[PDB]
């Protein structure tokens, strides 16, 4: 057959997802996680559909913004791949960890 | 359960692609799952504090807005 | 007769509702009669200044109705508005297309 | 009791939308967002003005304490303009009596 | 007959002498403890102030503070600050 | 009489002064009576905690008076206090000794 | 009378800052880069400060103006009237 | 002849300045700067000596903060020299710039 060279699907996967705004985590998975994490701080809580989507709209905004910073670090290391030691450097400079 | 794995590899990759990430080490996926959980935990904590203080057993969008604004991650288009 | 202060100031923004949100806000004991004017003024202006650019953003995507992404596109591309809204997340607004040169091929 | 009454700004966002782009409209979420936006900059300016007055032992937020809140919170050009439009609006209102 | 600038420095001494009776504190270091108290004053008086505004209340009660303090203070510092807080209101109401 | 309210709360921090700052600060219309208690309680407790750790800082250093640097060493070395004072500069406080490993000589 | 003072932040002084930094090795280009970031930072804080000074019809900038400025800028300083 | 090997004094110099707390910018220079910069906003100003000092404490603390963030970016690119690119990267992830 024919096949696209490692990367050129990615570059497209970028252009696609930058030009769009649909939320990229599956709605129900996320929501279960939210209630999982909420039981910690209080049992038999109830959420407004919107309040779940308010969280999901943030988490995604944040992670997106992180990866942006992450990617600039990986690139700073004359790399193209992102790795944990790039996230951690971002988050340290951001001031989330020590 | 353990719904954190419900944040599948391809979804994180999706976010990274919006982030403008070309290449993605296999480790990342679990790391991201960690950072995400911290973030949800922290927001949800303050959110549910705001709920409990109003004495409601239902968490509102406004709980979550107030939290995000405290946490320094202000959100537009759910009120407040 | 009766006339909405907003009228007397030439503003669409409700000078009265501002004056009230000020007193019930717990920003001070006392609020000058000029304060809610000057504020409604400055809220209107920035409301316009965003919508101006976001309306443009809609025409560019051949749309009559401004969606969030228009607002995002409007804000992130205006250096100042972007600064002012630096720590603000716009819902359903995604990210300006940016791809670092060294990632592009050939 | 039909319900309670959630005020907004959305009627003043329209009025201004139509002044600025009479042929252009706006989705619900986007009005949402512009509401959050008025509310957010409201507090910000009120706050800096609240404190401004506190700091100088004033009981009363005058226009001055808005203008200075704004000179402080807004970037160069957006502040020049906000100060202008707001000075304009005050001088008008005053000479309406 | 000079202005008359208050501070918290006499209470910092009072508590310094409770916890380290043999130790003291420079002007600069008190200066810091002074800033510290005003800082975490304003921080709490605010989050409380909000909490109230958000729930259409006109009165900041101890309840508001306890929420402010949960919100603003980390895990272990929070549990204790609530406790000494709880403890002090309880002691005060019984006392007289 | 003339009993002070700090006195009833068993606090050094002025339950008096606090109640007044609340009212005159424009935080709300009405201030509870339990409020300037619970606050002073917490402002005192946190004052203690810092001076507890910093007071040990000053032992180690073989000094009797606390200087800022003892406060810095106190705060920065405690995880919680450091989260709390995250965005707080401490004049004349300096930085915790730290040197990154890769920068050390191998021998 | 010396209209370009940014220079008075001398290479050695910046080296020392960088030492407290925990920096072992300093590119030459730095100093200027530093000087520049310094300039921005002072410019930003002092703007806000003078705003506060001016708001109080004073000709004299106070230690409190500088604190109110540092607090706004997100850069809070203990031990000058906090 | 006796000389210490490049980056040995440097390391001593660290230990020295990390143990101490005094302002490292000679004070007159710094003051002159501040007033030069105050002109840009209002002519014939005056400064409380404590104001001048409240700035220097602030600036010196900031810079020392940057160089730590800076220095972790240099190290991220398997380096040891700090370079403008590192500061640039640090300010970038901090939010001081775009
Ligand atoms: Cl007025
Ligand atoms: Cl009460």
Ligand whose nearest atom lies closest to the CA of D94: 1
Counting every residue written for chain A, the total comes to 98
Closest listed residue to residue B44, CA positions, set A34, H64, G24: A34
The residue in chain D having the minimum alpha-carbon distance to the alpha carbon of residue B79 is D36
- Which pairs with CB-CB distance under 8 Å and at least 24 residues apart come from F83-89? F83/E74, F84/E40, F84/E72, F84/E73, F84/E74, F84/E77, F86/A95, F87/G74, F87/G75, F87/G76, F88/E39, F88/G76, F88/G78, F89/G70, F89/G75, F89/G76, F89/G77, F89/G78, F89/H57, F89/H58, F89/H61
Residues of chain E positioned with their CB less than 8 A from the CB of F10: 88, 91
Contact E79/B at CB under 8 A: no
Identify from B60, B64, B68, B76 which residue to disrupt to test chain D contact, counting D C-beta atoms within 10 A and taking the largest count: B76
Q: G78 and E39: CB-CB below 8 Å?
A: yes
> Two tokens at G13?
């002084």
Question: What's CA D34's distance to the chain center, in Å?
Answer: 12
Query: Which chain A residue has the Cα nearest residue H91?
Result: A93
- Please list every residue in chain H whose beta carbon sits closer than 8 Å to the beta carbon of residue A85: 76
Way the structure was solved: X-ray
| Ion ligand 1: protein residues whose beta carbon lies under 5 Å | C 32, 34-35; D 62-63
**Do E27 and E13 form a contact (C-beta atoms < 8 A)?**
no
Which single residue is written with the structure tokens 């992102």? A82
DSSP for residue C50? H
Q: Are strands A46-47 and B58-59 parallel, antiparallel or unpaired?
A: parallel
Count of domains for chain F: 1
Q: Is B46 on the interface with A (CB under 8 A)?
A: no
- Residues from chain C that touch H95, judged by Cβ atoms under 8 A, are 86
This structure's resolution (Å) is: 2.9
* Rounded Cα gap, residues D34 and D32, in angstroms: 6
Tell me how crowded residue C7 is: count the other CB atoms within 10 A of its CB: 12
Asked whether C83 and A11 are in contact (CB, 8 A), the reply is: no
**Mutation target among G20, G74, G76 for the F interface, most CBs of F within 10 A:** G76
* Residues C92 and A21: beta-carbon distance below 8 Å: yes
Task: Look up the domain containing F92 and give its range.
Answer: 1-107
Distance E65 CA to ligand 2 centre (A): 9
Please state, in angstroms and rounded to a whole number, the distance separating the CA atoms of residues F69 and E29: 8
CA dist., res. A56 & res. H54, Å (int): 42
Contact at CB, C51 and D49, closer than 8 angstroms = no
Q: Supply angle C-alpha F55, E70, H94, rounded to 5.
A: 75
């Amino acid at each position: 057959p024919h096949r696209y060279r490692p990367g050129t699907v990615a570059l497209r996967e970028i252009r696609r997802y930058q030009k769009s705004t649909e939320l990229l985590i599956r709605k129900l998975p996320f929501q279960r996680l939210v209630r999982e994490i909420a039981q910690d701080f209080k049992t038999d809580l109830r959420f407004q559909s919107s309040a779940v989507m308010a969280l999901q709209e943030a988490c995604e905004a944040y992670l997106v913004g992180l990866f942006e910073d992450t990617n600039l670090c990986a690139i700073h290391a004359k790399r193209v791949t992102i790795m944990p030691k790039d996230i951690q450097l971002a988050r340290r400079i951001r001031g989330e960890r020590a | 359960r353990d719904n954190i794995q419900g944040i599948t590899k391809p979804a994180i990759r999706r976010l990274a692609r919006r982030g403008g990430v070309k290449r993605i080490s296999g480790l990342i996926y679990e790391e991201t799952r960690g950072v995400l959980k911290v973030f949800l935990e922290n927001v949800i904590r303050d959110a549910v504090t705001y709920t409990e203080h109003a004495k409601r057993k239902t968490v509102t969008a406004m709980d979550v807005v107030y939290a995000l604004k405290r946490q320094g991650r202000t959100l537009y288009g759910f009120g407040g | 007769k009766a006339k909405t202060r907003s009228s007397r100031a030439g503003l669409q923004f409700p000078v009265g509702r501002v004056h009230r949100l000020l007193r019930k806000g717990n920003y001070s004991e006392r609020v000058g009669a000029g304060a809610p004017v000057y504020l409604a003024a400055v809220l209107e202006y920035l409301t316009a200044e965003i919508l101006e650019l976001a309306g443009n953003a809609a025409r560019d995507n051949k749309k009559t109705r401004i969606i969030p992404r228009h607002l995002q596109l409007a804000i992130r591309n205006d250096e100042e508005l972007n600064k002012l809204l630096g720590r603000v997340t716009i819902a359903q607004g995604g990210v300006l297309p940016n791809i670092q040169a060294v990632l592009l091929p050939k | 009791r039909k319900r309670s009454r959630k005020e907004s700004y959305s009627i003043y966002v329209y009025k201004v939308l139509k002044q600025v782009h009479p042929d252009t409209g706006i989705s619900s979420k986007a009005m949402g967002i512009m509401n959050s936006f008025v509310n957010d900059i409201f507090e910000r300016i009120a706050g800096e003005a609240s404190r401004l007055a506190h700091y100088n032992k004033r009981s009363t937020i005058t226009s001055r304490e808005i203008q200075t809140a704004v000179r402080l919170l807004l970037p160069g050009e957006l502040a020049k303009h906000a100060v202008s439009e707001g000075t304009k609006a005050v001088t008008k209102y005053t000479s309406a009596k």
